[PDB]
Motif scaffolding. Sequence first.
Motif, PDB file in Angstrom:
ATOM      1  N   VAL A  57       0.832  -1.196   0.000  1.00  0.00           N
ATOM      2  CA  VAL A  57       0.000   0.000   0.000  1.00  0.00           C
ATOM      3  C   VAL A  57       0.867   1.246   0.000  1.00  0.00           C
ATOM      4  O   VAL A  57       0.552   2.236  -0.671  1.00  0.00           O
ATOM      5  CB  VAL A  57      -0.965  -0.022   1.197  1.00  0.00           C
ATOM      6  N   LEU A 110       0.981   4.175  -2.853  1.00  0.00           N
ATOM      7  CA  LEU A 110       0.795   5.567  -2.470  1.00  0.00           C
ATOM      8  C   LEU A 110       1.903   6.445  -3.024  1.00  0.00           C
ATOM      9  O   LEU A 110       1.637   7.534  -3.539  1.00  0.00           O
ATOM     10  CB  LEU A 110       0.733   5.688  -0.954  1.00  0.00           C
ATOM     11  N   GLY A 140       1.748  11.342   3.005  1.00  0.00           N
ATOM     12  CA  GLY A 140       1.910  10.275   3.962  1.00  0.00           C
ATOM     13  C   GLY A 140       0.587   9.636   4.335  1.00  0.00           C
ATOM     14  O   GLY A 140      -0.469   9.941   3.784  1.00  0.00           O
ATOM     15  N   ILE A 141       0.657   8.726   5.293  1.00  0.00           N
ATOM     16  CA  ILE A 141      -0.532   8.038   5.773  1.00  0.00           C
ATOM     17  C   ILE A 141      -0.310   7.692   7.233  1.00  0.00           C
ATOM     18  O   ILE A 141       0.815   7.417   7.650  1.00  0.00           O
ATOM     19  CB  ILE A 141      -0.844   6.797   4.907  1.00  0.00           C
ATOM     20  N   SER A 142      -1.375   7.737   8.018  1.00  0.00           N
ATOM     21  CA  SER A 142      -1.262   7.485   9.442  1.00  0.00           C
ATOM     22  C   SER A 142      -1.481   6.010   9.753  1.00  0.00           C
ATOM     23  O   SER A 142      -1.855   5.217   8.896  1.00  0.00           O
ATOM     24  CB  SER A 142      -2.245   8.354  10.218  1.00  0.00           C
ATOM     25  N   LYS A 172      -3.749   4.543  11.652  1.00  0.00           N
ATOM     26  CA  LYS A 172      -5.139   4.123  11.599  1.00  0.00           C
ATOM     27  C   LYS A 172      -5.648   4.009  10.168  1.00  0.00           C
ATOM     28  O   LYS A 172      -6.370   3.060   9.840  1.00  0.00           O
ATOM     29  CB  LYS A 172      -5.989   5.100  12.404  1.00  0.00           C
ATOM     30  N   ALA A 173      -5.260   4.937   9.298  1.00  0.00           N
ATOM     31  CA  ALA A 173      -5.642   4.856   7.897  1.00  0.00           C
ATOM     32  C   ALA A 173      -4.971   3.683   7.195  1.00  0.00           C
ATOM     33  O   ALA A 173      -5.570   3.062   6.310  1.00  0.00           O
ATOM     34  CB  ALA A 173      -5.313   6.168   7.196  1.00  0.00           C
ATOM     35  N   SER A 187      -4.299   0.847   8.738  1.00  0.00           N
ATOM     36  CA  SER A 187      -5.096  -0.293   9.178  1.00  0.00           C
ATOM     37  C   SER A 187      -6.391  -0.421   8.384  1.00  0.00           C
ATOM     38  O   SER A 187      -6.805  -1.535   8.041  1.00  0.00           O
ATOM     39  CB  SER A 187      -5.392  -0.171  10.664  1.00  0.00           C
ATOM     40  N   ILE A 188      -7.028   0.702   8.064  1.00  0.00           N
ATOM     41  CA  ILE A 188      -8.239   0.656   7.250  1.00  0.00           C
ATOM     42  C   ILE A 188      -7.939   0.127   5.852  1.00  0.00           C
ATOM     43  O   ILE A 188      -8.711  -0.662   5.296  1.00  0.00           O
ATOM     44  CB  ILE A 188      -8.897   2.042   7.207  1.00  0.00           C
ATOM     45  N   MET A 189      -6.822   0.546   5.257  1.00  0.00           N
ATOM     46  CA  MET A 189      -6.476   0.040   3.931  1.00  0.00           C
ATOM     47  C   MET A 189      -6.182  -1.454   3.946  1.00  0.00           C
ATOM     48  O   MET A 189      -6.527  -2.167   2.995  1.00  0.00           O
ATOM     49  CB  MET A 189      -5.288   0.807   3.365  1.00  0.00           C
ATOM     50  N   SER A 235      -7.588  -3.659   6.025  1.00  0.00           N
ATOM     51  CA  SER A 235      -8.905  -4.285   6.087  1.00  0.00           C
ATOM     52  C   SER A 235      -9.610  -4.271   4.739  1.00  0.00           C
ATOM     53  O   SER A 235     -10.281  -5.241   4.379  1.00  0.00           O
ATOM     54  CB  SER A 235      -9.772  -3.591   7.131  1.00  0.00           C
ATOM     55  N   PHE A 236      -9.471  -3.184   3.986  1.00  0.00           N
ATOM     56  CA  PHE A 236     -10.086  -3.100   2.668  1.00  0.00           C
ATOM     57  C   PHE A 236      -9.536  -4.157   1.722  1.00  0.00           C
ATOM     58  O   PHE A 236     -10.299  -4.822   1.009  1.00  0.00           O
ATOM     59  CB  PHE A 236      -9.872  -1.703   2.101  1.00  0.00           C
TER      60      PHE A 236
END
Lengths: 96, 97, 98, 106, 895, 85, 89, 92, 96
Positions: I13, I17, I25-27, I29-30, I32-34, I36-37
């Motif tokens: 991921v 990106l 960037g990405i945090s 929590k985001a 973790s959401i990716m 799960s997706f």
Amino acid sequence: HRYRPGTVALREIRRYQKSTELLIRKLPFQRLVREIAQDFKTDLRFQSSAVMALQEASEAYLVALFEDTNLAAIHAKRVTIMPKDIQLARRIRGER
Amino acid sequence: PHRYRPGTVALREIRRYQKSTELLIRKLPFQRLVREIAQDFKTDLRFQSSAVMALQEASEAYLVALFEDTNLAAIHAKRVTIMPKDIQLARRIRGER
Amino acid sequence: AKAKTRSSRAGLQFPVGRVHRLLRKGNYAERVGAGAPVYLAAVLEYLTAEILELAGNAARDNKKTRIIPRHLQLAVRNDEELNKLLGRVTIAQGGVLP
Amino acid sequence: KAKTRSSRAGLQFPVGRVHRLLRKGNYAERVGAGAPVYLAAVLEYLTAEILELAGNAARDNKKTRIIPRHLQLAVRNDEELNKLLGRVTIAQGGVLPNIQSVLLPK
Amino acid sequence: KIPTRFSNRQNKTVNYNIDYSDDDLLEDFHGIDIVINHRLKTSLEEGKVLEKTVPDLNNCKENYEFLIKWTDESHLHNTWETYESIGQVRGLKRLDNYCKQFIIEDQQVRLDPYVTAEDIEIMDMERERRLDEFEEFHVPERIIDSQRASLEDGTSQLQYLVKWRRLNYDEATWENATDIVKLAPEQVKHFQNRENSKILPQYSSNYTSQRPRFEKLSVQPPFIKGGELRDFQLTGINWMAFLWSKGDNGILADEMGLGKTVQTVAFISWLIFARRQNGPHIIVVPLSTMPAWLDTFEKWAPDLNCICYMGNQKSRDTIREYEFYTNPRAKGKKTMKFNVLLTTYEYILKDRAELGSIKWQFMAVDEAHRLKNAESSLYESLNSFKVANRMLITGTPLQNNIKELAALVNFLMPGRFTIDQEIDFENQDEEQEEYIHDLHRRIQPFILRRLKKDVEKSLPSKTERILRVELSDVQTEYYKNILTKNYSALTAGAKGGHFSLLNIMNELKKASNHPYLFDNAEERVLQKFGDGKMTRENVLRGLIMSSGKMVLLDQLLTRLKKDGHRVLIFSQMVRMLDILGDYLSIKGINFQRLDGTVPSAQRRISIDHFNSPDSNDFVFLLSTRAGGLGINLMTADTVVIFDSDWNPQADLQAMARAHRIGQKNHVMVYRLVSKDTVEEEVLERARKKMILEYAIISLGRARANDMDSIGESEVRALYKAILKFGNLKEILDELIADGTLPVKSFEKYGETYDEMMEAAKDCVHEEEKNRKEILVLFNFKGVKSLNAESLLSRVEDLKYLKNLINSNYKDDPLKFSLGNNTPKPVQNWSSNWTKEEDEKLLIGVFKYGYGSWTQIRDDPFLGITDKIFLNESKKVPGAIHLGRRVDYLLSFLRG
Amino acid sequence: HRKVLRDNIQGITKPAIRRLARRGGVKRISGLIYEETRGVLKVFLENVIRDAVTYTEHAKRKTVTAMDVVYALKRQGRTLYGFGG
Amino acid sequence: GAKRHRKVLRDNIQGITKPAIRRLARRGGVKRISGLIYEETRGVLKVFLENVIRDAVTYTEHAKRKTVTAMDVVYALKRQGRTLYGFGG
Amino acid sequence: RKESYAIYVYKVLKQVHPDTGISCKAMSIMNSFVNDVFERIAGEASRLAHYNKRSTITSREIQTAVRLLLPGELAKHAVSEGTKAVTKYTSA
Amino acid sequence: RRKTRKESYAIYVYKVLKQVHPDTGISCKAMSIMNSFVNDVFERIAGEASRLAHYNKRSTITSREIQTAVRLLLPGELAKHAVSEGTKAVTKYTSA
DNA sequence: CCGCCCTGGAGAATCCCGGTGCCGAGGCCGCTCAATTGGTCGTAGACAGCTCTAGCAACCGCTTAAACGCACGTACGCGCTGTCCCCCGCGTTTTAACCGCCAAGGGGATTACTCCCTAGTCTCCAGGCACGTGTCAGATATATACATCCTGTGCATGTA
DNA sequence: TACATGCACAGGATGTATATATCTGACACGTGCCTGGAGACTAGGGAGTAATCCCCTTGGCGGTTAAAACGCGGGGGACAGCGCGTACGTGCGTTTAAGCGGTTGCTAGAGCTGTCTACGACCAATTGAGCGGCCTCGGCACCGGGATTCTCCAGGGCGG
């Protein structure tokens, strides 16, 4: 055997909620099915039971939608269903 | 003294809470509710803190999406105030109860 | 020794050997225990009996000696728990509840 | 030698890991050779689709990191990602700003 | 019966009954039925001026009077009313709808000068047709029953249940008998004969396991009152009678125009008036031929009770109630009143239960090629019928393959032949030619075929001319793209991908006829040949040139018009007929068109407009399979087969619409074929069939009875017969036919009659010697109390009346005149009993006999319907008084 | 074995329910809405927690993990992203 | 006049007649019906069918067939949460 | 040779209602029903085995899948039916 | 003893990106959401392809089943661009 | 002279810019397990041939009930009006959620070892499917004894 | 004295319910076979168990302040009532097309048998990619001080 005025709709509700037959005519429905299928692939053939299954499913769907539409009409203190009731029922179900 | 007219502060709050993302129920009361419901299924259960947080995210998403349907049902009846019968209609049409 | 069916050993009418063969060939796990098909066939037979009892009562209330799809629909939609289990299901030629 | 199948397909997502996950998830008795490559290409396409919109939403708020709010805005503003994820809850995502016109002051 | 498994689940019991009642929702006429015709003046015409303009609805209301058919009437009660006369009643909207089209709109078109005179005369002819049809409803057709109803203080007038000519049995009404006899006495006479008839299904000789030896004859039998039976028609009757005597089932297979209906009607006449097989016979015909069948039975066999069974549910219930059994109300098994029943294929399938449960004696199926398929519903419904002998009437026993002929045979002979092999002209081994010889020899004793040339030689010959014409450029493009499934070129000019390649043979034939059969082909042509040809005569070039067949057809038409010839153009597709009807419209030729959309009312209009002597029509566009076998266009001369058929007989039947009995010119046929197309595969496959048909067909209780033993019931029957007819020696077979006397020889009846009169003469002799001693019954064979004096005096009475009427007014029993001297009147009866009443009574005892007073009372030919009151004001006359009055009037006549 | 909890549905206060209604876009709220929504929330939570405790008992654990809740939610058609899986 | 033009034919969606839609509303228990409902209902049905047929044809093309069978329809209905009993055998 | 559950459904019917028949369309509906609940239970037990890093589907998985899929009282009685059958099969 | 390893899609991921937004960037929590997706979409596609192979009585999951499942699950233009991406990858892989 | 509408301003709320400081996002590193390579081997699936049945196109005919067009009346939806109930906005008091810290210990995760339960393979037979046939109870037409009823004859008063 | 209509009465002919032989359709019995399920035996890994570690869950404490609770005035929105007008239902006459039965030849597809090869499973040896651990310094959050934007009400002006 004279019925009262204003009782034709109630007698039809009692009549059609007792029977189980299909309420759309078969030949028109089959023409509609073939016209819609034409837009996804040309020269398709259909088993007769495929069209019967489509008709059973589509009429179950429409009857169950008219029940929710009727609830939306009674909510607005009416007895006449209107297009805005179908739209409300379909948006709350998650289709719109 | 100065007073805002009825409905002005309500629209201001709709804009405030539709911009934020934080949880709107207090954490400690919700945790007590979760544990009380669970003790009627099995006694002496423990919970990971992330389990309670997942339950709270899901509960608040469910309730917010239910208030959207309830507001549509209230507008359908030509009102602006939501009432219990709006929640009941929305839940009946969804297929819940 | 003479062969006894696995369904008669458990006191069942539903076929335990066929349920075992369907578990082995449905890609459900790498291995299937010995009691899994017996347990599952018992549950399938129980649910079948629950529906057929109510559907035969419905056929008797309408002065009939033969179950038709209408009677299955009436039996299911009148039972609260059966209605929950079959909530997203359409019975063909079943009708609606009056 | 030593060359990953991802580099042979021109991909960033791991083809060998996807193949292993197909063979161990009880999906069939056998797994073809081009099924991992196809599936990894599709997962990479969908990831890039959502990350592009989330980075745009991050720019609109003058931010350089993507947070769950930006994934939520991206998904609910795109008409086809919203349909794919219609029954999904994104944690810490919020909602879209949307007030009904009947409630606005006249 | 005891369940061994229950549910321990504690769910509440439910009532599953879904039967409801609408009773909680609760709290034969005389109106306009039909509007026949109107009249120019409502009362009197104060002025014929102001004929211009078209009247308004209100104006029509105040200016016309209409002839109104009333509900619960019978057309004989049609009265002339006005909007004001009737005023307000049901059906008024029907009157308004009449005024809207027959007065307002009709006059509107007649005022517009854009309408040619030939259209005005057509509307005049059409109005004439409408009223001519409405005239046929007055004429009665058949009298069904007669009841002595009691009017409101109107004594008991006689009512006849009359069926009308062009109506069914739901339209049959009761009518006052006095007016019926004035209108049509012939049908009253037929009802009389049908009432007390000898030809009855219960009194038929049961020929079982032994049938009389038929004698081939050469005399038109006397019971055939039709006319001059042709020689080839007499041959068929002997053929059928021979086959019946042996116990076999044949096939009448003559060609059209030889009268196959007359031969089978005359055969049923033979089967009844000869072998006394007059049980229920059934004849299944197509609807379009039902009129021609009925009148045949009305002309060549007027004594048979033939009924037609068709119509709506109510109309078919009336027939079963009134015309099936002798006594319907009886709870026990009912008999049968009719001899012949005529039905169609539709009601064999609708009412197979009510019709299959009958012991038929003979079945005859017309147009039996409808049964060429043993898996059809009609086939499986006619095989379940319990019928003795069968017969099929078909001009084409075999059409395509040999399985059709096998199915026909298995219908006639279920198990005799076994035709389980199909001929193939590819192998052609000696064994297959043996198979052909075998079948051609085995079926010959069961098929009687004759030709229109082997008999009735006066017929102009027919010649067929095949013409092979090559494709054009657009046709070759389409044929190429379809043969390769090239979707892209076919759908480049399409409205929604409408080009479907399911059934490729169908598309190749559409291409081989005309490219315009496909969508948007009109756009490709015209635009790509002469862009900007939106004007006529240039579009005509698009029609004639875009097809190879249009070229040859156009040349033929120009050539044939100048010569004195007329054209019938046949096609398989009605869309090709639309294209032809446009080429002929732009050209300007007058044509007619008959396809499966033209209703039956317009079809006969078209056929007669084409066969009129002053007919401006040149060609007739015809669907090949439409119309049936009844179309007759013998005035035309040329026949153009535009599209061919997989079945050759279907094209031969299209040629027979001009090459029939009555044709007076040489019929010329033109087949249009496209070379190097699938069309050539049709002709070839047709030719094989034409050869196969030439190789298989076209090569040539709990108590026992007795015999003649006379019992107690036999003596009582002969005693009551001597109490009525008396001298029945010359009328023994008659009383034995209608079932009066039991089934005994006429010799034993004559012997017992001589014994009866002798025992009576000896009784009166003993009574004479026993009456002069100090100055009448006798038992015979067990029957006590038999009046000898009264019986012998009655014998002399009836014989006196016979020799007074059999030689005086023989050819007219009704026209009778008593003596100038008049006997003294009666003892003051309830009616005006004059001398004419006495004369009519004398004729009644002659026709209906003594004791049968209910028969004499119910006969409007005498005129004493309401003058006799035997039973239902207690009247003076009676059954004893009429008999004593006859014995008093006749004694006054003797001296 | 700990104590007994009771009357904790009342910890879902009227202010918190108003905030949840404002995020749904609601402008005016009846006074009978609060007890109605408490009942709806309690039913929802009973279903999810019943399924999650079933998952926990099958694994022979005594602690409810976040994956148990995520599976319980997924099987009711309410997938949740951001807590693993 | 104009006979070769195979047009002037009613649309196939209009074969769902107004009396048929009224019977369907009666089985749902509806008393009065607006006049604008009938064109609304036709639009809803047409969407529903388009979603099911699109899936069934997919199942048909994967099997290398040209014939839509009853199982294709049953699977297409099942995958959008509308299980149908009675044709699956 | 279609292989369905028709004869077993008929044997169960003759235990609950000995003097009752069933039509052919109703029998096909009952066949669809037994297949549907088979697939639901077997799929849920499959996921239970994957979540717990197990390779075998045992009676315990079937019991938990029945508790997750059936509502309320049905699940109690189906669990007791299954348990009784496994106990009888083993002690035999 | 030893902290067991845990597989995620985070590094892939992150590579995607950096291809789409090189400076974003990405945090945690985001990310973790990716993750799960990606797992959710994988499960959906693979389950539908498994069912497809069962309906046709096949023993193998091939790229045709993956393509058909992508057409059944993704809506509209997502499905078209996804099948083109997948076909292009299989073409480049096979020609190597 | 009155009513309404525009605006001016006051105050509350929100936005914007700068500063701070923090703690997680992103990079580097060592290693260790899973992906890769290369070889063998068996069977899945593709292809072929053959038979039998449904589906298709474009016509035909007949019956009958449904669909449709129009006229018309009234029941219902909708708009307006007034009242009063109840929810909102805001200020003052009370309570408890939160934060930060600490400690105990419960249980989940890991590792090592054992043994028993399931897959695989092979032999053998009966359970379930297709088929045909004997049998018994229900529906039905019919012979039969019983029963109600229309009917025809001998006695009687009246007229010639 | 004798002929003729009115009247009472006797007695068999026809209508009806019942027992009985006949036809029929579903039910139960018998056949076959063949294929898939059961019995038997073995190997080997997955599942169970015990012992240990360590982390993360529960519990307590104490202060602080944000949030909840509560009271109250009043504005506006819910709701009931009334009147109107038009759209919806009903009836009635007329048309139309659905349903059913039918044609004719061709092709798709299912089911069966049979051959054959390429592909994917499986395994052993190798190696590098990805994960856990560690570290640090920049994007973001919070705070504070103005700037500005927005809401609302009262007063002046202007039109009616």
